[PDB]
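Hi W., the cadmium ion complex you wanted:
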Amino acid sequence: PGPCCKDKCECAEGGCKTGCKCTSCRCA
Ligand SMILES: [Cd+2]
Ligand SMILES: [Cd+2]
Ligand SMILES: [Cd+2]
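Structure:
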């Protein structure tokens, strides 16, 4: 789950897809 933000965070270069569980980016 969470194919990104597993160590830091991106949400800028498409770093996120869906499973992203990082509650640090304005993803959802
Ligand atoms: Cd993030
Ligand atoms: Cd995100
Ligand atoms: Cd992410």
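The pocket of cadmium ion (ligand 2) is lined by residues 11, 16, 20, 25, 27 (CB under 6 Å).

W.
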